[PDB]
Amino acid sequence: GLEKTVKEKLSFEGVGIHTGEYSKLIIHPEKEGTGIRFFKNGVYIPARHEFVVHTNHSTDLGFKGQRIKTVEHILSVLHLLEITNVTIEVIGNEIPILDGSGWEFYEAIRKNILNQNREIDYFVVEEPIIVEDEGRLIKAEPSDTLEVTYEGEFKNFLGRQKFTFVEGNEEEIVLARTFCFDWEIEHIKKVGLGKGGSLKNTLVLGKDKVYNPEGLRYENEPVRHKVFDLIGDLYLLGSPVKGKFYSFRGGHSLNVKLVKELAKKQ
Ligand SMILES: CCCCCCCCCCC[C@@H](O)CC(=O)O[C@@H]1[C@@H](N)[C@@H](OP(=O)(O)OP(=O)(O)OC[C@H]2O[C@@H](n3ccc(=O)[nH]c3=O)[C@H](O)[C@@H]2O)O[C@H](CO)[C@H]1O
Ligand SMILES: [Cl-]
Ligand SMILES: [Zn+2]
Ligand SMILES: [Zn+2]
Ligand SMILES: [Zn+2]
Ligand SMILES: [Zn+2]
């Protein structure tokens, strides 16, 4: 595939799910070999694992005293579309959550793709690797195409479910929204997070219920979302990725752990 940028500057704005503050994004075109980077208060923050500063409830980056929260969704959409050269200017402290999915970013960026004059240098998984953390596991192995499976095991009605993304099925995961359980709200608010959360940008699930009046988009919308998150975190390898991945109960922390182990090995 050829390296790609955007045809023109694209803008997005809205509340950050964790800060509860308004922020604005400006996606700038960039030349071949630039890579994906964020820009905030005069500092460039590359979208790479060396710049990850926090992973508990979002994937956050920082450099030289400047931090940006919740990069997982914009990075997943850029990865899915193979956008390789772009500057994401952030006026604020977090990426806007919008409806909690990648839909708005995906629809706008997909209509503005500009192919460039280089073949993409893919990050190619060369051998099998397994990373683990207290009941959670992620396996990666060689593959000519990006294939990502997430298997969840939930304490509520969702039970045990899995979903697999393969290239060409981007539309199956870009609408899946972020979610949380009603029993998690206390903790998230207590640690100074979830300030912008509402039923308009997060699915809220209970032991037997879906609080959002619209309900779920898909019966397995939560696992489709976890696949979407893993594809965003994999872009921290700094190039579009080719490999077959299987995550059992993974989250941003384990995804970043896998990315760092893959980067170290290769
Ligand atoms: C008007 C009133 C409205 C009320 C609404 C406002 C409430 C406050 C706003 C909340 C906003 C946040 O909700 C945003 C936020 O944090 O969104 C995160 C997102 N970033 C990503 O976070 P992360 O990847 O780090 O998540 P974990 O993997 O760690 O899972 C998390 C827990 O699920 C367990 N788990 C996991 C997998 C499994 O198979 N089984 C199982 O049990 C696991 O053990 C752990 O206890 O995905 C999470 C989902 O999974 C989202 O919640
Ligand atoms: Cl925390
Ligand atoms: Zn090619
Ligand atoms: Zn926490
Ligand atoms: Zn997240
Ligand atoms: Zn997410």
Side-chain angles (χ1 to χ4, degrees), residues 54 56-57 187-188 191 193:
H54 176 93
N56 299 169
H57 305 285
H187 172 75
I188 300 177
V191 298
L193 296 174

Side-chain angles (χ1 to χ4, degrees), residues 203-206 209-250:
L203 253 349
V204 178
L205 309 180
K209 53 199 77 173
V210 177
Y211 291 92
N212 306 66
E214 65 272 18
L216 299 185
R217 294 171 165 186
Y218 317 99
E219 78 291 74
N220 56 10
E221 185 172 3
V223 296
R224 291 190 193 216
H225 190 77
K226 294 295 263 192
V227 168
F228 178 74
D229 278 343
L230 177 44
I231 289 167
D233 295 331
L234 285 175
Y235 211 6
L236 296 167
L237 282 160
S239 301
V241 178
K242 296 304 188 198
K244 176 198 248 178
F245 297 83
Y246 167 81
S247 177
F248 174 70
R249 305 183 75 247

Side-chain angles (χ1 to χ4, degrees), residues 1 18 21 29 63 74-75 77 80 95 103 115 125 177 187 214 217 227 241-242 247 263:
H18 287 309
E21 297 162 355
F63 188 50
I74 188 55
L75 292 183
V77 166
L80 296 161
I95 306 303
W103 181 245
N115 285 91
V125 174
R177 298 166 284 175
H187 172 75
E214 65 272 18
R217 294 171 165 186
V227 168
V241 178
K242 296 304 188 198
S247 177

Side-chain angles (χ1 to χ4, degrees), residues 57-58 72-73 229 252:
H57 305 285
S58 58
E72 53 263 40
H73 301 167
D229 278 343
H252 300 302

